[PDB]
């Protein structure tokens, strides 16, 4: 029935994996046992080596990611042994700690048990492990509007946020068998935050802006060789523009450009003054400066693009087809200043890969 | 043979044209005669009304153009009567004058005789009627590199440029029957140029930057109802970013960002300083300021995007499908600050339209 599609994707993944690993002769025998195990059990189990390389291939294949140069040094943590919510919680806690690494961020992924019959063993509700709540009630807007629905779902479960603009959401996830997810408050000792100051303009601190150190995406599905790891949070370090040009700048997010314009001392009255553009630049300089000053890893969009160029060169020379999403790879500020803007990319989907999946709330 | 495809496109265009013009009942009779005229002659001739509306529909359908809100007030000049190179030259001269309009730019198109049997009556070599030459010889780079090949072709024809960074190319075009194009120097009295100064930073004039007032694209084909107007130059006013973010900024164009960084007094040493982004913003403020100060029409990318939003609303309410090229509609600076960035567009080709065509040089 579905062993068909499972077997096909297994054949493709194992062949490619073992080839890249220099283990091409072990394929037919490895494929043999797998083909067998699928018949009796309806599935198969990745070795640690396969799972680790699959996770790395998935990152390499993420069309929208500019950071892909470092795909091969991803730190893979195999947590397929977890059975309890305490183990899940502690695995998420450790991921935060080890990835943060006192500010010298380690690109890391923690992999939980995969879907069995399409049945989730663990269902993580958070978009990112560290993320700020958002509230909207009777005209009143607080925090991160992108978090409004998860925040409301959290508050249905007994949690209550302090309603600052930067409430840390609890971890929230559901175990197979349980009807409701559980939630656990984040130990603040584990969460590095960076207050936003500007190198030249002292008044910038009057904005009282901050962001969290480590983006840890926890709601995408890792697909490896027909196996569906629906719960597999992964992190890197930020590209400054994600914070300065979007999270803090978008009208539907924190919407800070008018306030930025004010503290840097320019008028926000005329489009021709390009006050939004100027504000975007100073806000983005502030973000890079602040992360650097605090000893927290971050990359600017120019360096990131230069790295991606090397990713392109590396692919070609390894004889691998390159795929990418131009509309996502271009940075939201000065895009024509990067080589990305001036070439095209094939947006084909190659597996292994990370995929969106339906949210349990909403 | 090809009367087939000609008749099909005629049927589609006339129906749509006459409908939009409120002349739906005149269609079948108009279509009748056209169907007849195609049989005897192999072609058909647009009335002035049809040609004018077709040109406007072509602009409305240009997926890559952010300026489309004003499609319906395009000024159409019908020059299908020209027979001689003197008439062509004088028609091009007049187009420049009337479109410029002392700085209050009028979006205008001059339409020359269409292709007959696929045979061009008039073949315009210029990319734009007003454009700067470019030279590259023995390491030495002068002027606009995008113009290198046309400039070389011009210099094969007896013309010689002064080799400043802003040599105005002559008009160059070929008449049916002639083996070589002719060229005519531009009367400087007709060409408005704008020196680039900055509102706040006096040193900016040390760069001695300038650009021409009016972009007049002269190498695209207007297609209307199966008729191919290969020679039909059209102009609007500039969006500032075309000049400040591309023509003056691209490494393969005038490459001025390092010099901009210097005169505005910032270092150009570290990517994390975002010095390119800052330079782009000040250069783009300078361009808008300078055009405004001189009384020459121009639009900033924010106003232009707001206008385009109205173009979208106007389309919907008129029951017309909207088409666009997202990768071209987004401006090359602060794109995420415009609504364009945050929605998608169907990039389907609708006719009438303007099309690239093969260059006669090169
Ligand atoms: C090491 C530093 C990294 C940087 C600077 C980086 C940069 C980025 C950026 C800027 C985006 C766009 C996000 C957005 O605009 O919403 C992105 C998307 C993405 N990145 Fe990376 N990334 C990094 C590491 C990683 C890692 C470790 C993985 C997984 C193993 C990964 C997989 C992805 C995926 C799947 C997306 C697409 C998310 C979506 O479509 O919503 N990246 N990356
Ligand atoms: C009125 C002011 C106008 C503005 C501000 C404007 C703006 C623009 C801009 C910024 C581009 C992108 C060019 C590039 O990046 O290389 C563009 C492309 C285009 N515009 Fe407009 N435009 C205007 C008027 C017109 C008119 C009058 C027509 C024709 C009747 C036209 C047809 C087009 C076409 C065909 C393109 C695509 C050129 C290509 O693909 O290379 N536009 N427009
Ligand atoms: C590993 C990693 C590093 C880094 N610097 N950034 C990320 C990251 C950031 C944001 C996102 C989220 N992208 C958008 C998801 C989305 C898509 C559609 C609608 C929405 F509201 C939200 C994914 C990955 C991931
Ligand atoms: C009417 C009008 C107004 C305005 N503001 N801009 C233009 C305009 C500007 C530039 C262009 C040229 N676009 C790129 C053509 C091209 C395409 C591919 C390769 C190349 F080297 C050049 C076309 C229209 C046209
Ligand atoms: C409509 C458009 O495709 C969409 O809003 C995209 C555009 N490019 C993007 N690129 C990145 N990196 N992140 C985004 O959220 C978006 N938004
Ligand atoms: C590769 C890419 O499609 C191409 O270089 C485009 C990108 N978007 C653009 N958009 C505009 N307006 N003008 C351009 O020249 C380009 N270049
Ligand atoms: Cl984020
Ligand atoms: Cl131009």
Curated annotation (Swiss-Prot), chains A, B:
Keywords assigned by UniProt, alphabetized: Heme, Iron, Metal-binding, Oxidoreductase
Chemical reaction(s) catalysed: 3 reduced [flavodoxin] + 2 L-arginine + 4 O2 = 3 oxidized [flavodoxin] + 2 L-citrulline + 2 nitric oxide + 4 H2O + 5 H(+)
BP term (GO), one: nitric oxide biosynthetic process
Cofactor: heme; (6R)-L-erythro-5,6,7,8-tetrahydrobiopterin
CDD domains to which the protein is assigned, alphabetical: NOS_oxygenase_prok (cd00794)
Record-level Gene Ontology MF annotations: heme binding; metal ion binding; nitric-oxide synthase activity
Cofactor note: Tetrahydrobiopterin (H4B). Can also use tetrahydrofolate (THF) in place of tetrahydrobiopterin (H4B) but binds THF with much lower affinity than H4B.
Chain residues that bind heme: 65
Pfam family, one: NO_synthase
Its EC number(s): 1.14.14.47
Family label: Belongs to the NOS family. Bacterial NOS oxygenase subfamily.
Subunit and interaction comment: Homodimer.
Role noted for this protein: Catalyzes the production of nitric oxide.
Protein name: Nitric oxide synthase oxygenase
């Amino acid at each position: 029935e579905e062993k068909e599609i499972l077997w096909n994707e297994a054949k493709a993944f194992i062949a490619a994996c073992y080839q890249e690993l220099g283990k091409a002769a072990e394929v037919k025998d490895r494929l043999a046992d797998i083909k067998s195990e699928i018949d009796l059990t309806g599935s198969y189990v990745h070795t640690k080596e396969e799972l680790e390389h699959g996770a790395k291939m998935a990152w390499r294949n993420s069309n929208r990611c500019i950071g892909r140069l470092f795909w091969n040094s991803l730190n893979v943590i195999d947590r397929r042994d977890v059975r309890t919510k305490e183990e899940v919680r502690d695995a998420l806690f450790h991921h935060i700690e080890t990835a943060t690494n006192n500010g010298k961020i380690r690109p890391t992924i923690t992999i939980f048990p995969p879907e069995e019959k399409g049945e989730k063993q663990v269902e993580i509700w958070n978009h990112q492990l560290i993320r700020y709540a958002g509230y909207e009630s009777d005209g009143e807007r607080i925090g991160d509007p992108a978090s409004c629905s998860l925040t409301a779902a959290c508050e249905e479960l007994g949690w209550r946020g302090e309603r600052t603009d930067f409430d840390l959401l609890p971890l929230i996830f559901r175990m197979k068998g349980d009807e409701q997810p559980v939630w656990y408050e984040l130990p603040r000792s584990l969460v590095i935050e960076v207050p936003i100051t500007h190198p030249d303009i002292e008044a910038f601190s009057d904005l009282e802006l901050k962001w969290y150190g480590v983006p840890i995406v926890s709601d995408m599905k890792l697909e490896v060789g027909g196996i569906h790891y629906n719960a597999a949070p992964f992190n890197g370090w930020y590209m400054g523009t994600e914070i300065g040009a979007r999270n803090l700048a978008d009208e539907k997010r924190y919407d800070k450009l008018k306030k930025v314009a004010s503290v840097i001392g320019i008028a926000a009255d005329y489009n021709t003054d390009l006050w939004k553009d100027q504000a975007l630049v100073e806000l983005n300089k502030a973000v890079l400066h602040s992360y650097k000053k605090q000893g927290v890893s971050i990359v600017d969009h120019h360096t990131a693009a230069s790295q991606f160029k090397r990713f392109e060169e590396q692919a070609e020379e390894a004889g691998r087809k390159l795929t990418g999403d131009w509309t996502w790879l271009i940075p939201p500020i000065s895009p024509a200043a990067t080589h990305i803007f001036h070439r095209s990319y094939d947006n084909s989907i190659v597996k292994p890969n990370y995929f969106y999946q339906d949210k349990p709330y909403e």
